[PDB]
Amino acid sequence: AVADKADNAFMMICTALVLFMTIPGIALFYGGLIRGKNVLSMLTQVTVTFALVCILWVVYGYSLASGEGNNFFGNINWLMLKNIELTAVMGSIYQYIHVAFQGSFACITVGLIVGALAERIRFPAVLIFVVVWLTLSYIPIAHMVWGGGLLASHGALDFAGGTVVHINAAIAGLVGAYLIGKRVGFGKEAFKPHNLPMVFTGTAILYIGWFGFNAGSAGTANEIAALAFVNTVVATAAAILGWIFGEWALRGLPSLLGACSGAIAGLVGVTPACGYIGVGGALIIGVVAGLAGLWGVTMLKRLLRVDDPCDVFGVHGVCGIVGCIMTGIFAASSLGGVGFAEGVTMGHQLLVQLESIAITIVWSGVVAFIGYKLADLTVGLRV
Amino acid sequence: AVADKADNAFMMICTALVLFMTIPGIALFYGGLIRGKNVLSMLTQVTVTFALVCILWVVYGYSLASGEGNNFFGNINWLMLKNIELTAVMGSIYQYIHVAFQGSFACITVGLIVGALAERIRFPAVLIFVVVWLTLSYIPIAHMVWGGGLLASHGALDFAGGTVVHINAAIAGLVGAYLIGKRVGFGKEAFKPHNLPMVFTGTAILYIGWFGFNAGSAGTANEIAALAFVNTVVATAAAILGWIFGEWALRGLPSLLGACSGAIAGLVGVTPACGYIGVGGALIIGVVAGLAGLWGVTMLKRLLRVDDPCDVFGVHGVCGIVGCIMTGIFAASSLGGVGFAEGVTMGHQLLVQLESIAITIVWSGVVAFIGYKLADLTVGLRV
Amino acid sequence: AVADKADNAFMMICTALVLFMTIPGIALFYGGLIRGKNVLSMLTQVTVTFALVCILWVVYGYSLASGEGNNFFGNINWLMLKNIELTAVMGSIYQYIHVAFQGSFACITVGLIVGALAERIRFPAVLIFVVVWLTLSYIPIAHMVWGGGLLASHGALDFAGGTVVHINAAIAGLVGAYLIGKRVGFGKEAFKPHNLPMVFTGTAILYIGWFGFNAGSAGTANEIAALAFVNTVVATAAAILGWIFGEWALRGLPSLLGACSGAIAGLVGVTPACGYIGVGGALIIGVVAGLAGLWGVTMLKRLLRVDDPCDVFGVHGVCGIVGCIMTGIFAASSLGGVGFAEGVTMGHQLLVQLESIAITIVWSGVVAFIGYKLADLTVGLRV
Ligand SMILES: CCCCCCCCO[C@@H]1O[C@H](CO)[C@@H](O)[C@H](O)[C@H]1O
Ligand SMILES: CCCCCCCCO[C@@H]1O[C@H](CO)[C@@H](O)[C@H](O)[C@H]1O
Ligand SMILES: CCCCCCCCO[C@@H]1O[C@H](CO)[C@@H](O)[C@H](O)[C@H]1O
Ligand SMILES: [N+]
Ligand SMILES: [N+]
Ligand SMILES: [N+]
Ligand SMILES: [N]
Ligand SMILES: [N]
Ligand SMILES: [N]
Ligand SMILES: [N]
Ligand SMILES: [N]
Ligand SMILES: [N]
Ligand SMILES: [N]
Ligand SMILES: [N]
Ligand SMILES: [N]
């Protein structure tokens, strides 16, 4: 095929926006959630694992995620992008841009994990973990969903990565939280309000970059990109309002963290759905996702009983699951969505969504466990 | 018509840039201008009213602002974007992108108001105010200028919103300042220097997003976008220099706040003008706007006698008026501008600009008064 | 020729990204490296000199840098962009966009100098310095490399400005450091860790803007833009890892500043190379550049023996030189690069790179000396 320069332009900018979500979006986001004394370490781990992901992605991750192979992984014919002509076209853009855009997703996924857990994990251990989990969870799941693998073959709908990014990372992060203890200092049982403007700023950068993430997942500056863009605006706004409404009812007042969490919740919830649903579905998914995220972090507080940056994973995990399921509903044309595929009914699609969720949770959780254990066994996990 | 993917790409990115102006640009900007103790509240109000604006815009604001109707408002045929095919084209882009781009303008306009006043207005009251003022001031004025309404019909020149955004918001904000008192704590009579890097960072984000705002108002990545882009660079720079020059003359030294205010002043002043003037006109408008903004905040200090975030409205209001008037001059071809419309002379155009200004000020000020009073009467305005 | 709207769109967004590198990228970057008490001053100087550069660029810099003239400067036929029709096309974009994109490079180059030195230079003096050095170093060197001048005529390879931006600025900054003393307060001999998140955030913004810088230097959203984009990702990541590896070996632990410095090092090192090399060359240049930057700042510490923001110039200078030389190697097709030009062998190309480096260092250093001395003689350099 031949590249469309408009799509090339679009997709390079969307990739820059997705990179912005990690560098510095997620780092600032967690920077506002952890104690001053660990912020330096976290920023270093986020930056160094970002770099590591970037390199592993071009060395082999792109080939194994996006190369044709089997249901679970691709191939090694594109190691260091060998055999990719610079003018090769994937879709309607140069394949190199596709490489970069997909790599950026690997980065924010790993950033979501590392930003939360960095303060409790030894530096060499996080490096080992990322290698293991990027290689054996991110890459196969990305293959499965976006590389023509198992889940794509079953017709799972996941426009921009409710599974590959958010649930995948949430389970890995929650496994890390489970395996790696953290001493909560006296007086540090709740997030420090002084640092919450950094959480806001990170949320804002995540939101703006997420337009690259969601709209860019169209692969072209077309009407699906445009729909994904509008639905990102709408779901995020609806989830901010749903979360703050729920919080105002539960607690009697909105909070900044509630507003930011609601934003993330709608962004996560609409991620799988955004190119497949209408704007009404986006509104409803955003409201539900904001309320579900508030429920999820509320349940995690019952478990953890302190504020912890790993609470983020409750939002990514619960809202990723909610948005993946709700996609199976609101993709219906009767609700203004695109379409199910041939032969597919809503109930079928819902089962496929559930299957995709379950596979992602087990796959990621198993690989994460292995990667933490390997790190533990070789260098020691815990700070 | 058919969409141009280059314009689609351009316009989705410009919309992301405009959203960036609110989230987090204007929030950081005001975060540096208010006291630590109110920053949390302000960020919450900015984020929640942002969300509210986003939802009201898709529910009805787009239809009433941009639908065809009468001189003051459009219609309700596009409620929740019903009847808009995803492949509908407006101009040379998908209509959904137009929806999003226009919504982003509503958001930064409301953010300008809320960021300043949040610290003095009860949360439920700001929500009521935004509903009232978005619905009855923003939407009709946007209709009037960009939806084929009264001011467009009179040939008002306003490329990117000297009226719809800056004067509109400045009057609403100044009415709020007038109606809502604020106790100035001892020792807090001047902006805290420690927090001014946040003002800088917000100004910077407002500046970069403003390229989406001004150039995006061309609706296409053409030579008018390019002119608007260059004139944004030039007017902003010229106003930074004009403000700092005036400050250096008035006070004996430049200041960071002066530099940032000068940036805003040129951005605001060039907003109505940027697609219609030549680069020389942009330079002159920027210098004048920087000096006029310095004059305006100087006059507001005589009234307020303390530093207050509502001083921002002096810049938006004075520089919006100055840029709207100066557009009526520098749009002339003899000064390197585009053009007046058929039959139009400079003096005629100036009257039309003045008329547009006067209408915007009264309309916004009246609706703002009503929205504050309704809030007051129902939930209470004042913190 | 006729403009391609995709390229117009691309290039306006890339220009916004490059502007973002200065406003606020480099300001935040240095804001984290200098003492609280000087940050205000530095931000003011960065913002005001930014504005000055923007205006001088449209008044004459664009014409003298990009107009056809001689080996060292162009002409004055495009003063205030006169004689440029708004629909004039340069390459495949409107010439006005070219103006803006090139101006943005002038801005980040000057920001690199000013951000470092602002805290030690009087305000009027920095203004004089910028006028002199922009006019007599930046503009001629930009002419020389990108305006068809001496270095372009010799076939120097410099895709995005290893010479024009990084070495040029590094020598000017190092001359400033040499000529302008700075009292290091007691207790302030090392960068304050508390402020390093701002260094991270500035690095992040520099990184994301650098996609506009490097990919935008293709002048079109084509496969060279795409290659430049991927190589920016890869070289930056490789240099983060090379620096942190070197640091971990030298010091026993990675640091946040090391990670950020490594990012800058790969960004600088890949700047001249990014459109001419393959992704393997980018990886190798990034590793080498990260290690070379670590060596360079290590040598500057031996000279300075304190942490100082001018240490940045060791990275820009050393890594700019390394990347310019390495471009002469990795541009070879045998290493996956583009190409040398007709008749050119690697050894020839290396000599040309060395020549370009030497000329840039002497030219910039001489003009910088003159500009500092003129400032000193007229208003006084030192705070
Ligand atoms: C993404 C941010 C992650 C942690 C989210 C914190 C959100 C606010 O925190 C949550 O507020 C709720 C009610 O206001 C409570 O019910 C939850 O237990 C509490 O953790
Ligand atoms: C957009 C920022 C809004 C408040 C603007 C503060 C700008 C600096 O503040 C202003 O400085 C002037 C001279 O230096 C004085 O003449 C004004 O009274 C003072 O308010
Ligand atoms: C671009 C940032 C500029 C100053 C760079 C500081 C980078 C970290 O600082 C450097 O760390 C090295 C080993 O860790 C030492 O060998 C150097 O002497 C030290 O200056
Ligand atoms: N995607
Ligand atoms: N507009
Ligand atoms: N360039
Ligand atoms: N995320
Ligand atoms: N994400
Ligand atoms: N997030
Ligand atoms: N603004
Ligand atoms: N704006
Ligand atoms: N602003
Ligand atoms: N840079
Ligand atoms: N740069
Ligand atoms: N930098």
Binding site members of B for NH4(+): 217
Q: Is A373 exposed, middle or buried (0-12, 13-18, 19+ CB in 10 A)?
A: middle
Q: Shortest CA distance to C116 belongs to which of C273, C288, C350, C304? A: C304
CB pairs under 8 A between A and C: 149
By C-alpha distance, the chain C residue nearest A36 is: C194
Give how far Cα B169 sits from Cα of A358, B107, B162, B367, Å. 49, 11, 10, 11
Helix axes C196-216 and C256-270, enclosed angle (nearest 10): 10
Give the C-alpha separation, A349 to A331, whole Å: 9
Q: What share of chain B is helix, strand, coil (3-state, %, to 5)?
A: 75, 0, 25
User: At which residue do the structure tokens 């351009």 appear?
Assistant: B10
Q: Are strands B89-90 and A93-94 parallel, antiparallel or unpaired?
A: unpaired
CB burial string A107-120: b at 16+ within 10 A, e below: bbbbbbbbbbbbbb
User: At which residue do the structure tokens 């960020």 appear?
Assistant: B43
Is residue C383 classed as helix, strand or coil in its secondary structure? coil
Asked if A210 is an interface residue toward chain B (Cβ–Cβ < 8 A), one would say no
Q: What's the Rg (C-alpha) of chain C?
A: 19
Q: Are B86 and A215 in contact (CB under 8 A)?
A: no
Q: Are B238 and B290 in contact (CB under 8 A)?
A: yes
Q: Whose CA is nearest to atom 16 of ligand 2?
A: B298
SS (H, E, C) chain A: CCCCHHHHHHHHHHHHHHHHHHHHHHHHHHHCCCCHHHHHHHHHHHHHHHHHHHHHHHHHHHHHHHCCCCCCCCCCCCHHHCCCCCCCEECCEEHHHHHHHHHHHHHHHHHHHHHHHHHHECHHHHHHHHHHHHHHHHHHHHHHHHCCCHHHHHCCCCCCCHHHHHHHHHHHHHHHHHHCCCCCCCCCCCCCHHHHHHHHHHHHHHHHHHHHHHHHCCCCCCHHHHHHHHHHHHHHHHHHHHHHHHHHHHHCCCCHHHHHHHHHHHHHHHCCCCCCCCHHHHHHHHHHHHHHHHHHHHHHHHHHCCCCHHHHHHHHHHHHHHHHHHHHHHCCHHHCCCCCCCCCCHHHHHHHHHHHHHHHHHHHHHHHHHHHHHHHHHCCCEC
What residues does A53 pair with on adjacent strands?
Answer: none
| A229 Cβ contact list (under 8 Å, min separation 6) | A211, A214, A215, B12, B15, B16, B96, B97, B100
Is residue B94 classed as helix, strand or coil in its secondary structure? strand
User: At which residue do the structure tokens 């200028």 appear?
Assistant: B145
In the structure encoding, which two tokens stand for residue B191, read together? Answer: 């902006």
In the structure encoding, which two tokens stand for residue B338, read together? Answer: 């585009």
By C-alpha distance, the chain C residue nearest A17 is: C208
Residue C186's CB is within 10 A of a number of other CB atoms, namely 6
Q: Shortest CA distance to C29 belongs to which of A24, A363, A323? A: A24
Give the C-alpha separation, B209 to A86, whole Å: 32
Q: Is the dihedral of CA A84, A85, A86, A92 positive or negative?
A: negative
In the structure encoding, which two tokens stand for residue C261, read together? Answer: 């410095």
Asked if A237 is an interface residue toward chain B (Cβ–Cβ < 8 A), one would say yes
What residues does B94 pair with on adjacent strands?
Answer: B89
Helix axes A5-20 and B5-20, enclosed angle (nearest 10): 20
> B6 to chain A: which residues are within 8 Å by CB?
5-6, 9, 221
- C148 membership: H or E segment, kind and range: none
Backbone angles phi, psi at B226, to 5 degrees: -65, -40
Q: Which of A200, A220, A241 sits opposite B55 (nearest CB)?
A: A241
User: At which residue do the structure tokens 């004025």 appear?
Assistant: B141
In the structure encoding, which two tokens stand for residue A289, read together? Answer: 């996702």
Q: Are C207 and C225 in contact (CB under 8 A)?
A: no
Please tell me what DSSP assigns to residue B183. Answer: P
Q: Whose CA is nearest to atom 1 of ligand 12?
A: B264
In the structure encoding, which two tokens stand for residue C135, read together? Answer: 């006019």
DSSP assignment string, C85-123? -TT-EETTEEHHHHHHHHHHHHHHHHHHHHHHHGGGB-H
Judge if the upstream peptide bond of residue C24 is cis by omega within 30 degrees of 0. yes
In the structure encoding, which two tokens stand for residue A346, read together? Answer: 């809503």
Give the C-alpha separation, B99 to B338, whole Å: 27
- B316 membership: H or E segment, kind and range: helix B312-330
In the structure encoding, which two tokens stand for residue A347, read together? Answer: 């109930």
Give the C-alpha separation, C277 to C349, whole Å: 14
In the structure encoding, which two tokens stand for residue A295, read together? Answer: 């429920």
Give the C-alpha separation, B223 to C94, whole Å: 6
CA distance A127 to chain C (A): 11
Judge if the upstream peptide bond of residue C254 is cis by omega within 30 degrees of 0. no
In the structure encoding, which two tokens stand for residue A322, read together? Answer: 């909610």
Give the C-alpha separation, A268 to A203, whole Å: 12
CATH code, residues B1-383:
1.10.3430.10
Q: Is the dihedral of CA B233, B236, B241, B244 positive or negative?
A: negative
In the structure encoding, which two tokens stand for residue C96, read together? Answer: 């006005």
Degrees, nearest 5: CA angle A214-A216-A217: 65
Interface of C with A in 4-33 (CB under 8 A): 4-7, 9-10, 13, 17
In the structure encoding, which two tokens stand for residue C271, read together? Answer: 């700047």
Give the C-alpha separation, C173 to C317, whole Å: 9
CA distance A294 to chain C (A): 29
Resolution in A: 1.4
Is residue B121 classed as helix, strand or coil in its secondary structure? strand
DSSP assignment string, B235-285? HHHHHHHHHHHHHHHHHSS--HHHHHHHHHHHHHHHTTTTTTS-HHHHHHH
Degrees, nearest 5: CA angle A237-A30-C297: 130
Give the C-alpha separation, A351 to A331, whole Å: 14
Measured in residues, chain A has a length of 383
Q: Are C353 and C111 in contact (CB under 8 A)?
A: no
Give the C-alpha separation, A67 to A77, whole Å: 7
Asked if A201 is an interface residue toward chain B (Cβ–Cβ < 8 A), one would say yes
Give how far Cα C43 sits from Cα of A235, B129, B373, B380, C76, Å. 37, 36, 41, 40, 32
Give the C-alpha separation, C339 to C355, whole Å: 19
Give the C-alpha separation, B260 to B270, whole Å: 15
Select the residue from C220, C224, C229 to test the A interface by mutation, using most A Cβ atoms within 10 A: C229
Give the C-alpha separation, B164 to B61, whole Å: 14
Residue C69's CB is within 10 A of a number of other CB atoms, namely 18
Give the C-alpha separation, B19 to B12, whole Å: 11
* Residue B45: alpha-carbon gap to chain centroid: 18
Q: Is C4 left (phi over 0), alpha (psi -120 to 50) or beta?
A: beta
Whether residue A23 and residue C208 make contact (CB cut-off 8 A), yes or no, is yes
Give how far Cα B37 sits from Cα of A245, B43, B45, B187, C167, Å. 23, 11, 14, 14, 45
Residue C152's CB is within 10 A of a number of other CB atoms, namely 17
DSSP assignment string, C37-78? HHHHHHHHHHHHHHHHHHHHIIIIIHHHHHSS-SSS---STT
In the structure encoding, which two tokens stand for residue C41, read together? Answer: 């001053």
| A305 Cβ contact list (under 8 Å, min separation 6) | none
